[PDB]
Structure formats: structure tokens, C-alpha cells
Amino acid sequence: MNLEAKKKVLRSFTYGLYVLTAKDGDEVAAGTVNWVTQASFQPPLVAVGLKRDSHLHALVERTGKLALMTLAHDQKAIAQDFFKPTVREGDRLNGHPFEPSPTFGLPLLTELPYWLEAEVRHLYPGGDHSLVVAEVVEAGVRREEKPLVMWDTGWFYGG
Amino acid sequence: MNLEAKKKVLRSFTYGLYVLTAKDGDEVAAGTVNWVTQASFQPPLVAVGLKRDSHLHALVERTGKLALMTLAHDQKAIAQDFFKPTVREGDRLNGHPFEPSPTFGLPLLTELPYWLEAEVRHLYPGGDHSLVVAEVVEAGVRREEKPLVMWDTGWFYGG
Ligand SMILES: Cc1cc2nc3c(=O)[nH]c(=O)nc-3n(C[C@H](O)[C@H](O)[C@H](O)COP(=O)(O)OP(=O)(O)OC[C@H]3O[C@@H](n4cnc5c(N)ncnc54)[C@H](O)[C@@H]3O)c2cc1C
Ligand SMILES: Cc1cc2nc3c(=O)[nH]c(=O)nc-3n(C[C@H](O)[C@H](O)[C@H](O)COP(=O)(O)OP(=O)(O)OC[C@H]3O[C@@H](n4cnc5c(N)ncnc54)[C@H](O)[C@@H]3O)c2cc1C
Ligand SMILES: Cc1cc2nc3c(=O)[nH]c(=O)nc-3n(C[C@H](O)[C@H](O)[C@H](O)COP(=O)(O)O)c2cc1C
Ligand SMILES: Cc1cc2nc3c(=O)[nH]c(=O)nc-3n(C[C@H](O)[C@H](O)[C@H](O)COP(=O)(O)O)c2cc1C
């Protein structure tokens, strides 16, 4: 196939920026992700493309539980902080305060305006990423704000 | 759960705008979609949330074939034209010229800068939408342009 064109086409896709968290006892993982879409109104499903070779994947597949937070428009610095491995500093992950989510006790970054907790319904191991489909079981809004659009950061993850 | 919050959280997600096409003989369907994400680099997978109760879904599930085009930043008018049922006017669909895609003969809207053809690898019937995962088999670029970001239209499809 035309490989240069495939890369350019996939890089024309528009994404937001989100932090996905997971945990199992003392194992905690948090990572910035873009490959996220809603996948039904009823039930309320979210789909996430999750790198197979990652701690997040290992925890999500093992526990069937995840949390996802939307980054605000002024939070590119927070997104940057979750491209590196997750270190817990008391009640912070990579410098950012968290609280346990109400159903599953997953890390919710308090600074981020929108969050959801979700139970995995399906995992399709398609390639170097699995497509994880999860049903929203609880959510919260701290304030309404414009989210961080990947275009505005100059970053890409795709192609 | 907190339903008002769930709606607001899912509506904080960022999407692009794309036209998805499908066909089986004289049956042709084209629709504007937002629930689209890449789902692996290898193989090159795209995932689409496709309304179960739609002609697009019927054709995609039946033939296992789809095409997806990215709308340019100045093409909100084109996006609007594919929220209504698809009528073929010779070599146009809803006023917009198409050509057959090279592998599968699916409608490619010539005005749109980026296109891909894909073969369905997996279909998860999760709810009112199915999550269709497809591998990119051919693609093309007509020109590099900024894509249409859903935020900039004032439209929503989510919650
Ligand atoms: C712009 C951008 C967008 C991105 N979008 C996505 C996206 O959409 N989806 C996605 O998945 N990634 C995406 N990534 C990468 C993502 O941010 C990282 O994979 C994520 O930060 C890793 O989280 P983690 O530190 O908990 O995982 P890890 O890479 O695993 O690092 C955490 C620690 O866990 C250990 N570890 C590694 N593998 C395992 C394992 N299998 N079992 C137990 N422990 C392990 C490591 O040694 C490390 O110390 C993106 C990156 C960028 C730059
Ligand atoms: C902002 C926005 C975003 C959207 N995003 C998405 C998205 O992400 N994913 C998504 O799926 N939709 C999305 N939609 C809706 C999507 O644009 C329409 O479902 C699409 O335009 C329908 O295409 P169609 O006309 O070929 O399907 P149809 O609704 O089916 O209409 C085409 C014709 O086919 C007939 N038909 C209906 N059902 C069948 C059937 N099952 N078998 C055979 N024929 C049938 C109808 O009578 C009609 O004449 C979005 C809408 C908006 C407003
Ligand atoms: C920002 C970014 C962009 C990437 N783009 C591509 C790509 O275009 N094609 C591809 O095959 N892999 C791409 N990859 C994946 C890497 O080439 C490769 O799989 C590597 O293992 C990624 O490791 P890591 O993302 O866990 O750090 C990308 C990874 C990142 C971080
Ligand atoms: C723009 C748009 C937004 C929608 N938002 C919601 C939503 O918030 N919650 C929901 O349950 N359904 C939502 N729906 C789905 C409809 O309420 C309902 O399922 C209907 O059958 C949609 O028909 P149609 O999209 O095929 O025209 C939305 C549909 C559209 C067109």
C-alpha cells in the first residue's frame, strides 16, 4: 500500500488528551492517552486504545477497572508529566494530587475538571494496542472548562 | 450514578469529523461520524462507533469493507450534507463528487483531503452502536490540510 499516505491519513485524526489510571493494591499506573472515543449512549461505553506493552494495560486487563480524566485547555504541563513512568509521592502521582474514586478506589487527579470510572466489558487484542471497551459506572465534574485538544500541543501519536 | 455528570464528562471528549462510506452493489451509504480513533500502529487499525440502526452499519457488517475520509477545516458544509440519508446523483452523493476506491470500489468524496479503505477485523456489538475495528489496506492524500475539529462547529454527539 501507499505507506507515506497511510501515515499522513492517520495523523489527520483529531484527539483530546486524557489521563487514564489503574491500580491493584500497591501497583498504580497513570498515563496520558489520546486514542479514546465514546462507543454507545446506552450503555455508556468508552473505548480506549491501550499499548499492550504497558503497566496500564497489565492492570486494566487484570482488574477490569479504569478511570479516565479529561485534561483542561491550560493543562499541557500535566499531560507532559504522564508520559513518564508513574511515581507515587504520598497523595500525588508525578507531582499531581489524587483522590480515590468512589466505586473502585482508582486515582483521580484532583486538578482535572472531568472524570469517570469504568468497568471493562470487552478487550480486543488487535495489535500493539488492545481496544478496551468499558462501561461508565460513575462520573464527576469539578468545573466546566474547555478541554485540551491535541492539535494545540503540536504533539502526535498516530500514523 | 451521577447522570448529569456522566453526560458532561462524555461531552468533554474531543473528536474530528469524518465521512464513512460503504456499499454493496446499488446499496450505497455515506454518513458523517465522530466516534473514530486509531487502535494500533501494527497492524494499522481504526476503530469506529457505528449506530446499529443505520444503513452504514448494515453494509459494513455485511461486506466487511469501509472507507473513511477526513473533512478539512473549511468543510463544515460537507459534514452537514451527510447527516441526511444518502442520495446518489450520478457521480455525486448528496451534491458531492465521488470516485471508486482502488481496492474495494467504495465511494471516495474527491473534495476531502485524506482517505483510507479498510477491512473489518472485528465487530463488538456493545450497545446502540457497534465498535467496528478495521485494518487500513490502502490510503491517499490529495493535499495536506488542517482537519475539521468538532469543537469549532458547535455540534455535539456524545453524552
Ligand atoms: C502524545 C502521546 C499520546 C499517547 N497516547 C497513548 C494512547 O492513546 N494509548 C496508550 O496506551 N499510550 C499512549 N501514549 C503512551 C502513554 O502515555 C504511556 O504508555 C504511559 O505513560 C505509560 O504509563 P505507565 O507509566 O503506567 O506504563 P509503563 O510504560 O509500563 O511505565 C510504568 C512502569 O511500569 C513498568 N512496566 C512496564 N511494563 C509492565 C508490565 N507489562 N507489567 C508490569 N509492569 C510494567 C515499567 O518498568 C515502568 O517503571 C501516548 C504518548 C504520547 C507521547
Ligand atoms: C454531529 C454528529 C455526529 C455523528 N457521529 C456519528 C458516529 O460517530 N457514528 C454513527 O454511527 N453515527 C453518527 N452520527 C449519525 C450519522 O451521521 C448518521 O447515522 C448517518 O448520516 C446515517 O447514514 P445513512 O444515511 O447511510 O444511514 P440511515 O439512517 O439508515 O439512512 C439512509 C437510508 O437507509 C435506510 N435504512 C435505515 N436503516 C437501514 C437498515 N438497517 N438496513 C438497510 N437500510 C436502512 C433509511 O430508510 C434511509 O433512507 C452523527 C450525527 C451527528 C449529528
Ligand atoms: C509519539 C509517538 C509516535 C509514534 N508513532 C508511530 C508511528 O508513526 N508508527 C509506528 O509504527 N509506531 C509509532 N510509535 C510507536 C513506536 O514506534 C514503537 O512501537 C515503540 O515501542 C513505542 O514505545 P513507547 O510508546 O511505549 O515509548 C509512536 C510512539 C510514540 C511515543
Ligand atoms: C447530535 C445527537 C446527540 C445525541 N445525544 C444523545 C445523548 O446525550 N444521550 C443519548 O442517550 N442519546 C443521544 N443521542 C441518540 C438519540 O437520543 C436516540 O438514540 C435516537 O435514536 C438517535 O437517532 P439518530 O441519531 O439516528 O437520528 C444523540 C443523537 C444525536 C443525533
The answer to whether the peptide bond before residue B125 is cis (omega within 30 degrees of 0) is no
Rg of the Cα atoms in chain A: 15
Q: Show Cβ contacts of residue A89 under 8 Å, excluding neighbours closer than 6 positions.
A: A95
Cell, residue A15: 484527539
Residue A51 counted as an annotated binding residue: yes
Q: Decide if B56 contacts B120 (C-beta within 8 A).
A: no
- B105 CA distance to ligand 1 middle (Å): 39
Nominal resolution (angstroms): 1.9
Calculate how close chain A gets to B84, using CA atoms only, in Å.
Answer: 20
Q: Which residue has the cell 452523493?
A: B93
- A85 CA distance to ligand 1 middle (Å): 7
How many domains does chain A contain in total?
A: 1
What are the backbone angles phi and psi of residue B8, rounded to the nearest 5°?
A: -65, -40
Look up the domain containing A115 and give its range: 1-159
Q: Decide if B140 contacts A5 (C-beta within 8 A).
A: yes
- Mutating to test ligand 1, I would choose from A18, A21, A32, A68 the residue with most ligand atoms within 8 A of its C-beta, which is A32
Rg of the Cα atoms in chain B: 15
Query: Does A83 contact ligand 1 (Cβ within 6 A)?
Result: yes
Q: Which helix (H) or strand (E) holds A82?
A: none
In whole angstroms, what is the distance from residue B13 CA to residue A83 CA?
20
Tell me if A9 and B116 make a contact (CB, 8 A cut-off): yes
Q: Which of B70, B56, B63, B79 is nearest to B130 (CA)?
A: B56
Q: Which residue has the cell 491500580?
A: A23
**Residue A48 class from Cβ within 10 Å (0-12 exposed, 13-18 middle, 19+ buried)?**
buried
Q: If DSSP codes are grouped into helix, strand and coil, which group holds residue B148?
A: coil
**Residue A18 class from Cβ within 10 Å (0-12 exposed, 13-18 middle, 19+ buried)?**
buried
Q: Which residue has the cell 492524500?
A: B141
Instruction: Identify each DSSP E strand in B25-113 by its residue range.
Output: 27-33, 36-40, 45-51, 65-70, 88-89, 92-93, 96-100, 107-109
Q: What is the CATH number of the domain that holds B11?
A: 2.30.110.10
